[PDB]
Amino acid sequence: MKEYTLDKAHTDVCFKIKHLQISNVKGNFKDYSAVIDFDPASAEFKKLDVTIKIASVNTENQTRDNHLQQDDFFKAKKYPDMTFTMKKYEKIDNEKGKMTGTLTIAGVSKDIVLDAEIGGVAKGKDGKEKIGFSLNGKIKRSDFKFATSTSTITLSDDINLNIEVEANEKE
Amino acid sequence: MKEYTLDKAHTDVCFKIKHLQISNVKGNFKDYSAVIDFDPASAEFKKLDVTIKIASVNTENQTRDNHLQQDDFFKAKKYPDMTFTMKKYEKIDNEKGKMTGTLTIAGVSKDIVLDAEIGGVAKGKDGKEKIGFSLNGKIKRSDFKFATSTSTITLSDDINLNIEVEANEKE
Amino acid sequence: MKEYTLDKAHTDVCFKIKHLQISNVKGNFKDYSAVIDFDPASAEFKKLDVTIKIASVNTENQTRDNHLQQDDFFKAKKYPDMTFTMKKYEKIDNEKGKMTGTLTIAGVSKDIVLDAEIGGVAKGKDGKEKIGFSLNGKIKRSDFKFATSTSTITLSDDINLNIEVEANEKE
Amino acid sequence: MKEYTLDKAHTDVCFKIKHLQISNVKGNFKDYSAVIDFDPASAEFKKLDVTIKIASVNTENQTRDNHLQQDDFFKAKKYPDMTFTMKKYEKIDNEKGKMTGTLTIAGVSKDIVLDAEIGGVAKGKDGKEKIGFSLNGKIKRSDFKFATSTSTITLSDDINLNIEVEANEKE
């Protein structure tokens, strides 16, 4: 034999190990419209109808947004928009209520409950009405047979919805 | 009631969904030493003994390195170094062989097989010998009862070892 | 060389591959007590106080139940019971309301919302009152710094609570 | 109000929580054939060619076996068999060697290394030759662009192959 001494400068004692990390995908939609009927005297919603253009999704990453539109997700060719239609607002108090409505994602419809939190019914500087309010709720992918090819392991069955609204009186 | 029109500038239609991502943690060690006996005439290793100071770990993130030293991993207070001791080199050809040795991590010892790939036995510019070679192999965390508190789900049971060596003749 | 023909009877062409499966752990508690004040005239809860002996857990598997009592979960030596204390019942209608209360698990307390669904206020055969009702809600392990050693990956951050009650008038 | 006392017999204090579990899927194949050339004088394989009918898979569960044949796995309509072809046997000793060959799964081919362990070259009762031996190795799904729709998270990238053989001399 013969003896050698490492050259530490071009020697590497290395390892690779595989681990999982959980993270929230958080996105909005740039293009949607709604119809908002609300009675400040009784702090009750009368009509709330939303339509969201699936095309306009934004999860802060343009290449994933495209992927969202494909058949294993949105199918935005066949189903260009998702819709919400209020069927019932059950008041809790003047700040709080339980909105029940029909959500449709890619042609499938389920009734959902959103939690309404009224964040200040003012009369804005110009003398015309404003309202702020939020809608919050959890829907299950499986209820809408959504992304069915993707397992509940890789991607959560639960989707959390936060809708934040400022809004001004009509005409 | 009253009708409102969204102000799109301070309205947000948002969602959060939880997904998993797999990734390789890849690290070296800055401080280790070895004893290398190798016969270029027969391209056979005679003795290979490595000691790695656990303290010197580097997974490109100083806060995780600290965590590695703690009780749920290395226990580098009690067990400051990990060691490898060659017990057998079985030649395949002049470029290849199967090294069997004793690895000890935090006081526990198992016999492992590394795959030796001899990357060029030259005689360097100064007239003194050099060798390059790599050692590769997979060890299982569970074999060394390592990180036992962390599940094989979050972090892989398999650790991949790549050792890259350049080395110069002694005296 | 020489040629051979497999004996199919003592030959096996085998593979192993590792996969994940999600599943619900579903358990009750055999021993708990509560204080129930409820006004059938207005279908409103007045007081609801529950205490559950952690010791009495049952997830249909006696060896996991023991494990639940240990330091990485319940710590039932130090914290033998978990408690719920109603702070507010906000009526939705005669069948529905939103109960807010203080839940304590292993010494830590958070305010939670349960969904009350009143399932029939009858007067039982003997002339004395009965009520049926359910309480449902989701709590997050992380809110109670519960099982903190176990990742949100292996075990879900979300715990779903279903409390089913039949109950009879006092004295 | 009015006071009530739980009826413990029709009251349930329940929870559901979601957890992951890892497990090995372990299967064989009932129908395959091979060509085996082996020289007991030098304990070296000369030719080893295997063909496995994908149709004949068995993971101890008939409904998963069917699923294996579908487009997101085997595609056994289009690709009815998988094949292994020895290209090189590099001897380690009389009990051990490193077999390199071409594996094809659903039309895609990669060179793999199996670990040969010769388990006893006897001459059976009738005066004709027998051999026992095993082949072991790990292949990566990703190398064969196999099950590409299924994530490396749900199902492991690594497949472990164990081939166990008894075999008798020809004619």
Please tell me the total count of domains within chain D: 1
In a domain, D151, yes or no: yes
Phi, psi angles (nearest 5°) of residue B43: 40, 60
In a domain, D13, yes or no: no
Neighbouring residues of D46: CB distance < 8 A, sequence distance ≥ 6:
C1, D37, D38, D39, D89
In a mutational test of the B interface, the residue from D141, D152, D153 whose CB has the highest number of chain B CBs within 10 Å is D153
In a domain, D48, yes or no: yes
Note whether D22 contacts C23, CB cutoff 8 Å.
no
Note whether B98 contacts D93, CB cutoff 8 Å.
no
Q: What is the CATH number of the domain that holds D120?
A: 2.40.128.110
Asked if C17 and D159 count as a contact pair (C-beta separation under 8 A), the reply is: yes
Residue linked to tokens 């409950």: A113
Neighbouring residues of C102: CB distance < 8 A, sequence distance ≥ 6:
C83, C84, C85, C87, C109, C110, C111, C112
D99 to chain B nearest CA, in Å? Answer: 11
User: For residues D21 and C80, what is the distance between their CA atoms, to the nearest angstrom?
Assistant: 29
Q: Amino acid letter at A135? A: L
In a domain, A77, yes or no: yes
Reading the block at residue B48, the tokens are 């290979």
Neighbouring residues of A132: CB distance < 8 A, sequence distance ≥ 6:
A118, A119, A120, A165, A166, A167
Q: Amino acid letter at C56? A: S
Give per-residue burial for D31-53: e unless 16+ CB within 10 Å, then b. ebebbbbbebeebbbeebebbbe
Q: Amino acid letter at B158? A: D
User: For residues A168 and A130, what is the distance between their CA atoms, to the nearest angstrom?
Assistant: 4
Method: X-ray
Residue linked to tokens 């388990």: D119
In a domain, C15, yes or no: no
In a domain, A92, yes or no: yes
User: For residues D56 and A23, what is the distance between their CA atoms, to the nearest angstrom?
Assistant: 40
Closest CA relative to residue A87, chosen from A68, A120, A113, A63: A113
* Structural domain range at position A99: 22-171
Breaks (C-N over 2.5 A) in chain A follow: none
Phi, psi angles (nearest 5°) of residue D94: -75, -10
In a domain, D88, yes or no: yes
Name the neighbours of B, counting chains with at least 3 Cβ pairs within 8 A: A, C, D
At what resolution in Å was this solved?
2.8
Cβ-Cβ contacts under 8 Å, D93 against chain B: 90
User: For residues C52 and C27, what is the distance between their CA atoms, to the nearest angstrom?
Assistant: 13
Cβ-Cβ contacts under 8 Å, A151 against chain D: 151, 154
Find, in chain D, the residue whose alpha carbon is nearest to that of C45.
Answer: D1
In a domain, D66, yes or no: yes
How remote is the C-alpha of B147 from its chain's centroid?
Answer: 15
Asked if D100 and D90 count as a contact pair (C-beta separation under 8 A), the reply is: yes
Distances (CA, A) of D15 to B55, C23, C97, C138, C147: 44, 13, 20, 9, 15
Closest CA relative to residue C114, chosen from D13, D98, B163: D13
Q: Is A23 on the interface with D (CB under 8 A)?
A: no
